[PDB]
Design a protein around this ligand. Structure first.
Ligand code: B12
Ligand code: B12
Ligand code: B12
Ligand SMILES: C[C@H]1O[C@@H](n2cnc3c(N)ncnc32)[C@H](O)[C@@H]1O
Ligand SMILES: C[C@H]1O[C@@H](n2cnc3c(N)ncnc32)[C@H](O)[C@@H]1O
Ligand SMILES: C[C@H]1O[C@@H](n2cnc3c(N)ncnc32)[C@H](O)[C@@H]1O
Lengths: 179, 178, 179
């Protein structure tokens, strides 16, 4: 059972990137970071420059700020393992541009199940707080939850990362109750 | 391993409804949605109309915006499975109306332990964010946490749903340490 | 295997404290609550008065608002189980003072791995909401995230408490996928 797709979900500073990187690097495959993120403020400019300087020379980086599905179709193959650094930031680029988010979330789950070579998606959980007091935050919260539902379904494996520790929730049989 | 009561907890758009609906249809009993809110804005009006179109003729609807406990005691019988749509919206009704929340929370947990028929409670986790900046939201966060704890103790089974996927957390031996 | 150090993580009003207290009281060593919390409002005062009336006189209090690593090295002995009230409030005290958080967190991880006696850290998850409106809250989200990771590494056991129910996530075999 070599898997062809893994979804890693966790909160903010959960350890999910470090965990993703560790699976990618123990694969003995040719590694490509698919990057959805553009540092456009100082806070964000830190994280990219600083934590990139602690990736091996072994990694290759391709940017995909909008056309994530298209990039995966083209760049995926059996010698390569692709890592999508943030589904979260990709969805945010689309939301802020005014795209309707259903078709591309739907395209991404399709692409993930029909992929040439293996891929790891890293995504945030944003759904476990108080309902946001603005239409934008609320609309993102729905797209993020739906998207993580459609990836988790399409992907062979799914792991949840809490406090730097990983827990497989797929593969694995879901509970079924007897009333 | 037979049960009377299930709590399904998850975040917003976690797939907890889908999951409660699947366990409900799996039982073959007669099926009642206990709706705990009508929709008073456009966004809510829509979420409650896709839900309506995705339930076939096996499903009946009884409203209980406030007297959820009483309604569960009248309607719960062995031919029936009741699904409480959102505990979260119920607590929201009580909180805004100015009710003290401890007595009705305790009465729901007591009611859950003693029902004539089976029931699935669907509820949100709301306590994994940054401390909210207003007394109303902090009070909701305290009350939804107590309510999820008292239902979870009362209920036979508890499932946690992430990214459309359920994990049982009750029954199951809890950790112990030397 | 008898353990040195337990991390207890979960959301607001999840049963973290009650769970921590149950394990502490089942251990039959001497019980010290390492309080980190100044009730400087009505809500906060009621929270810690409902806690203190639910504890047999078997419990002794000790305040550590700022110097929590130091306080743990000085009070820990196998004759004693120590329970820190809230890692979260300790972090908050430091953030508000203007301290740089990295050193004091790494110091605390170090100390937890090398204790004279058993300790339980009780800590909040705050990473699963929408990004905060303001830098103060963002800075806190990243620090509480980093702190839970390092304390999970350093502690022998990690539990995750949802709706009053503890799941053990460490020790246990981290899932490994192969592609
Ligand atoms: C119940 C509810 C609350 C609950 C919280 C529930 C929660 N999950 O945290 C409580 C009572 C806390 C609440 C408080 C408030 N909320 Co309110 N309420 C809602 C409502 C109706 C449902 C949200 C929810 O329960 N989850 C939805 C669940 C059931 O779906 P799910 O996928 O299964 O999860 C929403 C949404 C809406 N109608 O659009 C607003 C809504 C988000 N609330 C709103 C308001 C006005 C507030 C308050 C500011 C109230 C006030 N005037 O003081 C506070 C803000 C709290 C904050 N964000 O800091 C507005 C937001 C307006 C805007 N976009 O500018 C909304 C959209 C409703 C409206 N009036 O139209 N609310
Ligand atoms: C520590 C703390 C913080 C921490 C975060 C804690 C967390 N959980 O995220 C930090 C420093 C980040 C913080 C930030 C702020 N908070 Co503050 N602080 C608190 C305090 C005292 C403890 C909350 C806590 O950590 N509880 C979680 C644990 C301990 O509880 P448990 O899970 O049940 O266990 C709270 C609550 C309170 N009642 O005072 C306020 C409190 C919520 N904070 C407050 C304020 C004003 C803020 C800030 C707006 C300050 C600022 N000027 O930027 C920000 C923004 C918060 C936001 N939601 O954006 C006020 C809110 C006032 C109001 N309701 O009108 C409170 C009520 C303090 C007070 N007495 O005034 N806060
Ligand atoms: C993507 C994003 C959003 C997303 C949501 C992302 C999320 N919930 O995770 C959306 C589009 C919803 C959003 C909305 C807003 N956010 Co925004 N955006 C960001 C950004 C760039 C990403 C951080 C992140 O999502 N995850 C990081 C992931 C990859 O890693 P990890 O989570 O640690 O793991 C941030 C942060 C930043 N410093 O740039 C701001 C940022 C936090 N957002 C900002 C703003 C202003 C907003 C909005 C007010 C936009 C608006 N004008 O309505 C709302 C408010 C949201 C709220 N209610 O709290 C500002 C906040 C400024 C401040 N004073 O602190 C930031 C700092 C950007 C900026 N420099 O101007 N945002
Ligand atoms: C959430 C808010 O953050 C800003 N924004 C959007 N994308 C980025 C980015 N990659 N880096 C920094 N700021 C960003 C915009 O101003 C948006 O409204
Ligand atoms: C959080 C805020 O949402 C509004 N409110 C309360 N209940 C509902 C509902 N079912 N649908 C829409 N809006 C609602 C009120 O204005 C409340 O103060
Ligand atoms: C988030 C805000 O909470 C206040 N604050 C800090 N510590 C406490 C406490 N123990 N109790 C109540 N309020 C507190 C400060 O004013 C800070 O700005």
């Amino acid at each position: 059972d070599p898997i062809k797709s893994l979804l890693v979900v966790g909160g903010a500073r959960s350890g999910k990137s470090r965990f993703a990187q560790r699976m990618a690097e123990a694969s003995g495959r040719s590694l490509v970071l698919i990057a959805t993120a553009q540092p456009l403020d100082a806070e964000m400019a830190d994280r990219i420059s600083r934590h990139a300087a602690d990736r091996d020379a072994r990694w290759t980086l391709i940017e995909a700020f909008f056309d994530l599905g298209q990039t995966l179709r083209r760049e995926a193959q059996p010698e390569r393992l692709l890592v999508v650094d943030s589904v979260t930031l990709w969805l945010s680029n689309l939301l802020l541009r005014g795209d309707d988010l259903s078709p591309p979330i739907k395209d991404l789950a399709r692409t993930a199940a029909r992929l040439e070579g293996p891929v790891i998606f890293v995504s945030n959980e944003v759904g476990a707080g108080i309902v946001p007091d603005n239409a934008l935050a609320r609309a993102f919260r729905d797209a993020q939850g739906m998207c993580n539902q459609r990836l988790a379904e399409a992907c062979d494996a799914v792991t949840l990362v809490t406090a730097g520790i990983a827990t497989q929730i797929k593969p694995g049989p879901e509970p079924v109750f007897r009333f």
